[PDB]
Amino acid sequence: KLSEEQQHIIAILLDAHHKTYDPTYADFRDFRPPVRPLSMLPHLADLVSYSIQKVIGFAKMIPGFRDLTSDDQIVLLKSSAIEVIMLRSNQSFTMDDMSWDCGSQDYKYDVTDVSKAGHTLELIEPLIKFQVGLKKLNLHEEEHVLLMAICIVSPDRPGVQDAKLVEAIQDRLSNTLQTYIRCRHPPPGSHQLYAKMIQKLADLRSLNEEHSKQYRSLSFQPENSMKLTPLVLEVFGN
């Protein structure tokens, strides 16, 4: 049974996601234009930078996240940003053609697009498998917003200080998710759903690690990192 506290938590995370994820994608008109050997770097860099801002505005609203010091807040958002971007992007992802469809042909991103941003199959293939496996879980929006929150507030992020507090916040969220699945997700969809969602957090750690390797290699050449944004440089490095 969902406590009043637990229904509260879900209500706040849902509203937080609604206030930070525009499914009309109206702001995409502001990005440097897509061009279809690193011709998608400006556009995708801008997409990413915008998406870091949204993911921060979500994080702030996670009940308890604000009780963390500003230095723990920063550690959690730097390590998780690319993972929450990959998560939250499942919403525009479509298995119809293994692409992210943000509203129009211009803003429909496939394998070739990501490779024209400096990435290789070593990232892209596992990224597509992840998106596919996440879609097949068929999460309730309540589950989706809980997983993003659980992702941000992970006590194992290198650099964390008050791990105990991060863990207590995260536990409150994990417990809410486990109880939500039990009370509101009907079988068979719910079979081992919690363990499948935690698996997706492990897939994201390995995606984060490969994304970091190739980002570092892309951004080594000052000519490429000229095309990023200042927020992207600050959050992802150099």
């Binding site: 801002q53 921060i56 505005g57 702030k60 500003s70 807040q73 920063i74 958002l77 730097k78 200042p230 927020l231 600050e234 959050v235």
Partner: peptide, 10 residues
């Protein structure tokens, strides 16, 4: 350190 992140965090 992370002034842009710090600022978005209020």
């Amino acid at each position: 350190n992370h002034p842009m992140l710090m600022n978005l965090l209020k």
